[PDB]
């Protein structure tokens with residue numbers, strides 16, 4: 001009846017001394033090279049259990065999937081959410097807001113023809129945008145996020161933002177900034193020492209500012225929607241939820257009230273924007289570093305699709321190389337290295353170890369994506385990871401950027417279809433040029449913390 005081994009914590013600071021807040025993953029991966037695939041850490045006051053490799057992670061989150069289905073803290077987002085919404089909540093609230101969210105996204109056609117024709121249409125609205133930069137050197141950052149956010153916006157708001165909207169440019173700035181903070185040294189020190197640091201001046205404060213800015217906005221769309229509602233036919237995600245808040249007024253235990261609504265919508269709007277767009281911004285850089293991979297994707301396009309029409313999402317079965325490249329950007333790029341934290345919601349026996357009720361769990365998603373048993377060159381960019389000798393597509397149990405188990409990314413379906421199309425559609429129209437030689441492109445991360453962020457680069461989209 002004892003915890004997993006680990007370095008001796010100090011009082012209050014925990015294992016501050018053996019942790020590099022500038023790369024948290026490598027610090028935790030060094031400790032496991034010494035203790036094992038399951039060890040115990042303290043980030044400040046918080047006792048965490050950290051899981052390493054495909055085996056540790058799968059047996060935790062899938063084989064005992066119920067007991068590891070809790071949610072732990074991300075103190076940056078916990079300052080805003082306070083345990084409300086679909087993503088950062090626990091128990092009876094998590095199961096209801098999740099059950100309702102999946103059912104509703106399917107209403108608006110996630111992984112269906114509706115959202116296909118929305119993405120397909122927005123993808124062309126971006127093609128125009130990039131054909132009108134005329135080959136000149138740009139930052140791809142806010143072009144991509146604009147386009148990516150517009151898909152999720154259609155679902156949650158009822159329609160899209162205009163690309164010329166000054167206030168829209170602002171909301172995307174608020175996501176990029178709050179998100180990049182979680183990845184920085186101070187971001188990872190804030191995980192450790194939130195209790196103190198939320199009252200101290202510093203970068204943390206600028207990130208509450210933008211979080212606060214984001215909530216405000218969403219709560220202004222909830223007001224406008226609320227007063228102009230039509231109870232017998234819904235326009236968007238907010239409306240459907242409003243319709244369920246009415247029906248649930250007689251029930252005092254309901255999880256469908258104003259604050260849960262507002263929080264769950266931000267979960268969706270924030271996640272539908274910054275994780276598919278970073279993945280693309282990373283993927284472009286990885287394509288200009290690897291020109292022989294770019295040329296091969298282009299060729300698979302012209303023979304399967306051509307130049308005339310617009311790529312669908314079933315054009316995908318006849319495209320094994322391009323679908324490998326997209327899985328390999330997703331695995332190399334390593335979006336959320338430690339995932340969202342979990343928690344055991346009751347006393348738990350796991351592998352001879354004991355985990356008390358409320359124990360926090362770090363499922364290292366990045367160490368599965370770099371499990372050397374499943375990948376032959378774990379830290380190189382090789383699309384042959386996702387192919388066999390006959391050139392067809394090879395699924396891997398260690399491809400887990402979207403997590404596994406009971407609290408896994410229900411936004412995975414939307415994201416898969418978005419990635420395929422955006423990537424195919426852009427590269428069907430343009431080839432990418434860098435202002436620097438392929439041997440001189442630094443494809444290593446700028447910040448790695450809660451997210452993996454790629455470095456800054458300028459680029460050209462010149463037509464074919």
Ligand code: HEM
Nearest residue numbers: 087271272275276335339340401402403407408409411415
């Ligand atoms: C490449 C893009 C994306 C990646 C790599 C990604 C990855 C992840 C990961 C690792 C989790 C953690 C789940 C856990 O607790 O174990 C997660 C959760 C979540 N994701 Fe995504 N995600 C992406 C895009 C999206 C999109 C487009 C949406 C919008 C519908 C979304 C919505 C969510 C939500 C609501 C959760 C919380 C689930 C819960 O706590 O029940 N994600 N995602």
Ligand SMILES: CC[C@@H]1C(=O)OC[C@@H]1Cc1cncn1C
Nearest residue numbers: 087179266267268270271274275
């Ligand atoms: C930026 C934090 C995001 C949020 O508020 O809701 C969930 C989320 C974390 C996340 C999950 N999938 C993508 N992201 C960025």
